[PDB]
A paper describes a structure:
Methionine synthase (EC 2.1.1.13; 5-methyltetrahydrofolate-homocysteine methyltransferase, MTR) forms a crucial node connecting the methionine and folate cycles in one-carbon metabolism. MTR catalyses the methylation of homocysteine (Hcy) using 5-methyltetrahydrofolate (MeTHF) as the methyl group donor, to generate methionine (Met) and tetrahydrofolate (THF). MTR is a ∼140 kDa monomeric protein comprising a catalytic N-half and a cofactor binding C-half ([Fig fig1]).
Initial screening resulted in separate 2D classes of both halves of MTR. A larger dataset was then collected which allowed us to determine a 3.1 Å resolution structure of the 70 kDa N-half bound to MeTHF and a 2.8 Å resolution structure of the 68 kDa apo C-half ([Fig fig1], Supplementary Fig. 3, 9, 10). The N-half structure of MTR^FL^ confirmed that the Hcy and Fol domains are TIM barrel folds with the short Linker 1 (Pro347 to Phe371) that tightly locks the domains side by side ([Fig fig1]). This arrangement implies that large conformational changes are required for the Cob domain to interact with the N-half domains during catalysis as has been suggested for bacterial MetH. On the other hand, the Fol domain showed clear density for the MeTHF ligand ([Fig fig1]) making interactions with the conserved residues Asn470, Asp537, and Asn579 through its pterin ring containing the methyl group.
Residue numbers in the entry: 17 to 654
Write the structure that this text describes.
Amino acid sequence: TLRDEINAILQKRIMVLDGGMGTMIQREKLNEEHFRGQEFKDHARPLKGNNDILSITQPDVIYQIHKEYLLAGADIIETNTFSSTSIAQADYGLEHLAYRMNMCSAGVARKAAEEVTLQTGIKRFVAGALGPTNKTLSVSPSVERPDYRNITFDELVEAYQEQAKGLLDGGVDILLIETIFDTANAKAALFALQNLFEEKYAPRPIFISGTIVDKSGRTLSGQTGEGFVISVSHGEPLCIGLNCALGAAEMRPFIEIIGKCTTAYVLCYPNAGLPNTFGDYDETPSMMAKHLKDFAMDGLVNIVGGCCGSTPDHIREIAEAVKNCKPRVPPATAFEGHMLLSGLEPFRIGPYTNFVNIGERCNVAGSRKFAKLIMAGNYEEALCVAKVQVEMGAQVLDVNMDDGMLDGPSAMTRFCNLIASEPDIAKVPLCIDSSNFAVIEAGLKCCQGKCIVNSISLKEGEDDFLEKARKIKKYGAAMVVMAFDEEGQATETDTKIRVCTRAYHLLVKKLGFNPNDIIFDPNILTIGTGMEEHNLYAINFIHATKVIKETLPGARISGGLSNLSFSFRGMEAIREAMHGVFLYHAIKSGMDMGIVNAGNLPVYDDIHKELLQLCEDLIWNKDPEATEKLLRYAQTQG
Ligand SMILES: CN1c2c(O)nc(N)nc2NC[C@@H]1CNc1ccc(C(=O)N[C@@H](CCC(=O)O)C(=O)O)cc1
């Protein structure tokens, strides 16, 4: 296929990609009438600056620019489709022409590429450019309305699907998602491409490139380079990297950081310097070539090019500068064995990582204050619960909106839109928790980075479990599997182990799920209720954790720690002691994380030895009188 050829080429030499088409068009200096051409002379809206209309109104200009860039030593050419989406063309009243526009852009690029290939023999590739669109999905249009978004995930998916249909019909060699101001739009584009690649179309190599705004190392949406790489890696892009907004000097540390994270190839095409007082990117090709040669000699990049200001002369010098340099060797084992999550910043859970706290208080069912604020519609104050949880050591936030008095998906969407408006709350990943999959999907469609999906199980059969897991894998998030199957909840140790193994071997084999993104939950259940059957639950959970961690490679273990101490509600000291004692054994067992009250967990040495011993008898069933002995001890505190 085409991906095999591109991979073979990238393993031997550095590939040169396009340049400043948007500036070469300004060098033509077309007026209003050239934009209209023959067909759009009757159009009632001005097409000034619509660089994508030239694929039909002035095809010769675009073809000649492609030819000049191609003879300037370039190897990959972007199609003239930066704003050819139905949303970007809305400012010009050409919503209905996106498919035709993309077909004609692909054709006019393909003719030039084929002619140059016939001239030189060196095969040239055409990359379909998917624009970021002026609409942002993670950034509110207005500061006063943080939860408001003027575009949704489904609309963006539909528009990008419409664009990529025309691109694929035209026969583009590569699909390129570039100048990403918001990685959520990149995820939507990947979603549309994944729909297309299974509905009719054969797969294509996928190129992704972000845009770092300034020296902060963060995109316009606030996410850093590692977070971006983690967020968009679920689509398995052949190449990732940066472009624009920074020269070849300021971009080097971020390219280093990104190349240290991804196992895919690194593509870098920056600006041609900085804007002068006259508005021109005046860095001569001599400095650009030497800077890209410095990038290549160190082994930072595998594809080089140029952003705005890169005339074909810049590409002509660069293709000679990087002619002899060896390609970058990717870190084929980059963070092997780790679990990669992301918010505005990367989050990693490796073999040596300590116990990971997941905040429980962002739960309508489980939290009193959060539920009281949510039913009142005061999400503005409800964000403070997540803020305080993060301030108290919670590394992931668990969001649950399941209630019969609330519209699930709408509340979940509003809260996930409000979360992204605050940086420190948004830098930690989210755990999307709901018994309804329509709420999990709504939560995933709003998240910027890579999140965790909670409460999926084998309850409704193997087929439904596989369908849900396939949808989640397409969404690219983490997944918590409950110990629940067709026969009911798993209470015994062997039942938990059987259910978890059956879930694991379906995901890994039938679906090809990533083994490091599976988080089994052996269903921590309440003890101390005074019922005989409610005594062994901690023991079965611990033994099942041991057995699962010792036999399922990569799979993590979590649990609802607060569920264990339901019988002692109101006696918060005993609840904290029980949580600490249970954690001391679960972490030793292999419990990687859990939905825990992050700020209310004590160290195993602090707990009073009498209370610690009583919790030990109750948890480990060392004494049938422990459940009453604990209450008897509690009554002494009055
Ligand atoms: C059901 N359980 C659970 C689970 O067992 N497994 C998974 N994967 N996920 C989850 N998520 C929900 C739940 C764990 N979350 C909880 C569990 C218990 C509580 C709780 O007891 N809250 C106290 C109030 C505490 C407060 O007001 O802050 C109460 O009296 O209800 C609060 C949150």
